[PDB]
Ligand binder design. Structure first.
Ligand SMILES: COCCNC(=O)N1CCN(C(=O)c2cccs2)CC1
Length: 121
């Protein structure tokens, strides 16, 4: 299954599955500072799923590993901001992270396999 470009549409599909999840509700767009005045005291590099989709659709990811690093940053930002491990929004992040990781694993494997096949000779 050696298509080097297949990851992109697979990532567009998994973003659609994430935008149909109620658990993505907090992570679709940026944190408003009026609501969270200290957010940028704690979080150096904001990230949200609309920004990930924009970066993909513009052609500014070279690999699904780059997309995966930004999605992971959405979840580490929630872990760094939460004042408790049992907050609503951090709890939503952990379920959404599990869903993401379950679905991205074959996208990554298939892409890495395709590059190795390309380089074989
Ligand atoms: C509806 O969503 C609006 C945009 N998102 C947003 O305001 N936030 C998600 C990122 N945040 C967090 O993960 C945490 C908050 C409380 C604990 S963690 C901080 C608030």
């Amino acid at each position: 299954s050696y298509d080097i470009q297949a990851w992109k549409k697979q990532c567009e599909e998994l973003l659609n599955l994430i935008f149909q999840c109620e658990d993505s509700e907090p992570f679709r767009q940026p944190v408003d500072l009026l609501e969270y005045p200290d957010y940028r005291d704690i979080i150096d590099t904001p990230m949200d799923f609309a920004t990930v989709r924009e970066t993909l659709e513009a052609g500014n990811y070279e690999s699904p590993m780059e997309l995966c690093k930004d999605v992971r940053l959405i979840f580490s930002n929630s872990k760094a901001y939460t004042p408790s491990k049992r907050s609503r929004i951090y709890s939503m992040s952990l379920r959404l992270s599990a869903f993401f990781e379950e679905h991205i694993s074959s996208v990554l494997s298939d892409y890495k396999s395709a590059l190795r096949f390309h380089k074989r000779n």
